[model samples]
Target: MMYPAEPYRIKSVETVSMIPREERIKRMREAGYNTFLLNSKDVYVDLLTDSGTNAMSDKQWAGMMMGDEAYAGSENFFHLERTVQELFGFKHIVPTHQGRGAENLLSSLAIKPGQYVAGNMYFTTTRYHQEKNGATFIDIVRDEAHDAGLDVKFKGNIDIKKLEKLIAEKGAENIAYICLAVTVNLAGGQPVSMANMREVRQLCDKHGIKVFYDATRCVENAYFIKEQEEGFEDVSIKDIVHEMFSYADGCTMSGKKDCLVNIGGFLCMNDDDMFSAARELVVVYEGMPSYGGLAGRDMEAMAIGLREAMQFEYIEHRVKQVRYLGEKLKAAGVPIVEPVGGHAVFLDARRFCPHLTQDEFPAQSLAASIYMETGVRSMERGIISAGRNKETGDHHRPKLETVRLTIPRRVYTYAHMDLVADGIIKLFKHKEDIKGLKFVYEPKQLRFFTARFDYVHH
Candidate 1:
C-alpha cells in the first residue's frame, strides 16, 4: 500500500524505545492488562488516543515564545479568540484547559434536568458530563454506523428520521440541544456529511432547538467532505470548516486534536446571552475567561496551530497517513471498521476475537494482547467504554466492540505505521489464543480509564 508524503519536515525529535518481550509481559501484568494503565516509557509505539499528543510546528513554537503572561485579558487569549472568530466564524470564544472543560461548561449552561441530549454517537467524557447535569444522551446516528463491515460515504450522518421521532416522542422543550460531533469518535472516527448537517440544522430550526458541535476533529471531517461531497471539491478546507460551523449554534473544541497543540481547548458561540453566562461559569470552573485553565503560551501555540491545520497540504497528508495504516491492515485481511476513519483504524474485536464474548470484555482483552505482543499501545472502545446504564445497572451493550489505533498528527512516520501494521498482522494469525478479561478494580465512573482486569480462561 502506498502512503502519502508528509507535508512538513521534522526539525526536532524525542526518543522512545520498546522493552523486551519478557519485560513487556511483566509490564502488561503489572498494569492490570489495561493499556491506559501502561506506563508511557514501556510503550514502543503509542496509538492510545490523538488527544493532546500531536507535534507542533516551528511557527507555533515561535508564537509560544511571544505569549503574553497577563492573568486577565491576555493578548495571547485575544489572538486565540480572533483565530477562532475568523476560521470558525464564531462571535465569542472561551478558552478551556482542554475539551472536557468546555464540555462541562456547555453541559451546565444548556442542559436542564429531565432533558435529552441527542447526538450522532456517544463519547466517553462528553456523555459523562451530560449525564452528570441530569440529561439523558440519545444516539440518533444512522443505523449504518453500527455495522462494522458497512462501507458508506457518511457513516457518521445522523438519521434525520430518528431525530424527528425523538423530538416527537420527547417534546421539543424536553430536548435540550443536539450534540453533533463532526467525526463520530465512537463510530470509528467516521465523518458526517455536509448535506446531513444542513438537514439537521433545518430540522432543529423548525423545532427551536440549538445544535452544538464537538468540533474536535472538524478539520479532518472537512477534508473528508472535500474528497467525498459534491460542490465542495473546489472549496478550501478552511472554508469548508467555516461553512460546517455555520450550521451549528456553537462548538466545544479540544484544540489538542485539530489545533496540533499539547494542551488547550475552547468553547465558541454566537449567542450573546449564552456567552455571558459561559464567561461567568469559566471563572468558577476554569480560571479567568481570558486564559481559562491554560497558560498564555499554550493559547498562543494553539492559535498558530489552528491556522496551520487549515493548509490544504497539511490536512490532506494527515487524513491520508491515517488511511495508509488502515489500508495495510485491511489488505492483510484484518477485521477493521470499513471505510477507515479520519483519525484511527478500529479493529472489530468481536470478529478479531470470536472466542471471547462481550461480557468477557473482548475489546479490552484484545487491546492488552496487542500491546503485549507488539509493544504498540491501543485503546478499548467497547463494553468498558460504554460503561453501565444508570437505570438498568447492566453494561451498556453497544453494538460495536473494537480497539482504536488512534494516530497523532505530525507524529510517527510511515515506517512506524508499517511497524504497527506488521505487528497486528502477526497477531492476527493466532487470534484465537487471545484471552478474555474480567474487571479486577473497576472505577464507579468511566471505568475504562482506570479499571484493572484479569485474564479469564475458558
Candidate 2:
C-alpha cells in the first residue's frame, strides 16, 4: 500500500494488440526463437529494454513544441547545455545522438592502442567501443556484484584492490581512465555508493588517472545513495547527483534513460582541451557542433526531461514501480536477483531453468519461453550477450545469467506488471517442459541483437 501511487493523473491511453497463443507461437517461430527479432506490433508487453522507450512528461512535450529547428547554433541546444551544466556541475557539454555516439567519440579519441579501460562492469556498447579502439576492458567491481544472490547493499562498488593491481601490473600511464557506470546495468542495475566513489577519486588522483562516468542512469543511482548511504538520507536527489558527479572528470550520458526523453545524449567535461578534441568529432561523426545529431525539438525535450527526471516524486514512482514487480515475483517464489535494482527486474535464469546448462544458454532460452508463455518480450544478459573472449574465441561465461524484464518508465501500470508476473510464474512452473536453443544464424559481433536460434533436441 506504500508504493507511492502515480504522482499525476493519467491524461491519455493507448490500446495494445494481443494475438492468440496459437498465433503467438507462429510469430515466435518466425522470429527464429529470439525475442529481439520479434515485431513490436505483436508484443503485448515490452520489457525487452528500457532504452528510448520511456514516456515523456507534459512539460517535455511542451518543450518539444517550443524547439528552435535552426541548422547551426540552435537555441534549444543552449537550453540543453545549461540544464546539464547546472545539474552535473560540468563546464562544457557536447550533445550526441545517444550514449554510444559519445562513447565512440571518446574511446577512439581519448584511449590509445593497448591502453586499459577499467570500469565497475562492462556495458555492451561502452566496452565494444573501447575494444574496437584497441583498448583492453577490465571489470574492477566487487566480487559480490557478479553473484545474483549476494545481498550486498552496493554491489556496483568498484574493487579498489583489483584496480590497484591492474595499475601495478600495467603501469599508470598505460591506463587511460576509469570508466565508472553509476547504476551498473549488466549487474542487475546495481548502484555505486558515494563513499566508494570518493575512494575511487582518491585513487585516481594518486595515480594521475581520470574518471569518466557512464552517467546514463545517474539520477536513479543518486536516489539509491540518498536512500541507503549514511549521512545522506536528508539530502535532495539533485544535490546527491551533483556530489556523485563531483568526483568524475567527465561523463557520457544517454538521455533516453535518466533524462526522461525518447532521444538525445551528451558528453560533459571540465577540461577545455578534452572538450575541444570532442568538438571537432561532433561535426564529423554526429552533426553540427550546436545541434549534434539530434533535432532542436529533441534537444528541448531532453533539457526539460533532464530537470523533470530529478523530481523526488517522479523518481519515487519510478523505482517503486520496478520494486512492485520484483516483490510480486518474489512473493510468488520466483527466482530473481536479490534486493531488486532501480530500473528492471532480473530473473535468475540459471536457477529457474536449471534443466539447461550455460552452453545451452539458459537465459536466452528462458527469454524466448517467457515471450511464448505470454505476449511479453524480454532480453537475455547471459552468455550470448556477454559475447566472447577476443583471444580464446570462446564464450565469456558470466556468473549471473539473467533474463531481464526492463520496465520502461511511465509506460505500464501495476496491473500490467501483475499480468507479467503471472505469466512468468506460470512459465517457471512448466520450465522442465521447456527446451534449450542453439544459434543457427549468429553474427560475428554482438550476436544477441540479431542471432537466430532453434530448439536443441536430444
Candidate 3:
C-alpha cells in the first residue's frame, strides 16, 4: 500500500542568472564556504551542493540571526535540544560544519591505526575518512541481493553473526565500534530493521564496545522501519526515531539530507568522555561551543528546520515521490536496486551492461551516457568513488556497479522525477549503442571523475 497517492507536480522550470560577477566574488568574504551555497535552477534538482536549502520563513531565518540565547542557553537551542532529547534521549549534542566533519571527528576519536570498523554498508565519504584515520573498514551486507534483479528487498540489516565473528577474531580492543548507517547509502539507501538495530546494540553492549549511528538519513530509515518491521506499524515517526537513537551510544548527522537545513551537521553522545573530546574539537575546528562552528544564524535555522523535518506528512511526500520514480523505472524494464531505496533509484550498471567486464569500465560509460543524453548528473558508486591505494595499488571494485540518483528533500516534484525516469528508459532502449570506456588522464585514485571515457561508435 503506497502513501501519498497524489504525486506532486512541477509547473515550470526557472533559470536564474548567477549573482553578478563582482558581487559573487565579493560574497566570498566569509572564512568558510558554507554561506554562498545555492540550489540548482534548471533541472528541478540540486546536485551535490554542500549546504541544504535555506529556510523559507522569516521567523525561521530570524531565529538564527537573533542569537537570543535560545541556541545553547536560550529557548531556541533548548527547544531543538528538547526535541532531540525527546527523540533520542541523548545527553550531549555537538554540532559540526557538516556531516563529514562529524564523521572525521568521531572516526579519529574512536578508531586507531590497525583497528577495524564495521557496518552494514559504508558511504564513500565515511569509508574514506575511516581509511584516512588508519582504520580498516568492512561491509557485512548479505550477498543475496548482489544480482537479484528487481522485487527483492535489500534488507539493510547487519549480519549479526558475521559482526560477532569479526569482533571475536579481532578481539574487542582491536575493534573500534559497531557503526550503523540508518539508511544504508551504498546499498541503495536500504533501511535496517529496528529489531536488528536493537540486536546490534545488545551485541555491542555484550562486548563493551561503542556503537555509533550515522543518522544522516535517519528520517527515511524510521519511516521504512515503521512500514517494513513487524509490530511497528502503529509507531509514530518520532517514537521510531527515538527508539533507534536509543540503541546507539552516539550519532553523527549530515544536516543537508534528512535534517532539512543548510550547511550544518552534529554529533551527539551520552558518554561524557567522548562528548568532551568531541566538544573540544568542535571548539577548535568549528567555532565557539555555543554555535558549534556554524554562524549564529545557521544554528538558528538548523534548529527551526530540524523541528519541521519530523513532520510525517512532509517526509511522506518526499519518500512517495522517489518511490514513484523507482516504480516507474522498474515498470520500464530498467535495472535498479531492490526494495526501492529511499530518495534515490540506483541503476545497476553491471546488469544494464552485462557484457562489459568490470575492467572494461561499464559504470563509467553508463554515468557519462546518462549525463550526455539528459543533462542530468548523478553520483557514480563503483571503483571510482571507492578510491585506490597507492603503495599496494589495490583498486576497490563494488559488487554492484551503480549510479545513484539522489532526490533532494523538498526540492523536486513528480514531473522532474518522470523526466529522469524517461531518460533512463531512453538509455535502456539504446543499450546496443552504448560502449565501454577507459581512463586516459587517471588521477591514480578516485579516477571516475578525473578520468575521461570514450564511447565506441559502431
Residue-level lDDT tens digits of model 3 in 49-150: 313752334456567567654345655455556656667779988778788888888887888899989888787678888889888987766554343453
Taking the tens digit of each residue's C-alpha lDDT, what string does model 1 give over 284-362?
9999898999999999999999999999998998989999999999999999998999999999998988877899998
TM-score of each predicted structure versus truth: 0.93, 0.94, 0.83
In every candidate, how many clashes are there?
A: 0, 0, 7
Relative to the true structure, candidate 1 has a C-alpha RMSD (angstroms) of 2.3
Q: Model 3, which residues run further than 4 Å from truth? A: 1-80, 145-154, 354-360, 386-397, 438-440, 444-446
TM match of model 3 to true structure: 0.83
| Tens digits of lDDT, candidate 2, 74-105 | 88998999888999999999999999998988
Task: Give the Å error, residue 113, model 2.
Answer: 2.7
Which residue pairs collide in model 2, if any? none
RMSD of each: 2.3, 2.1, 6.2
Top model by lDDT, which number? 1
Instruction: lDDT for model 2, please.
Output: 0.90
- A best-first ranking of the candidates according to their TM-score comes to 2, 1, 3
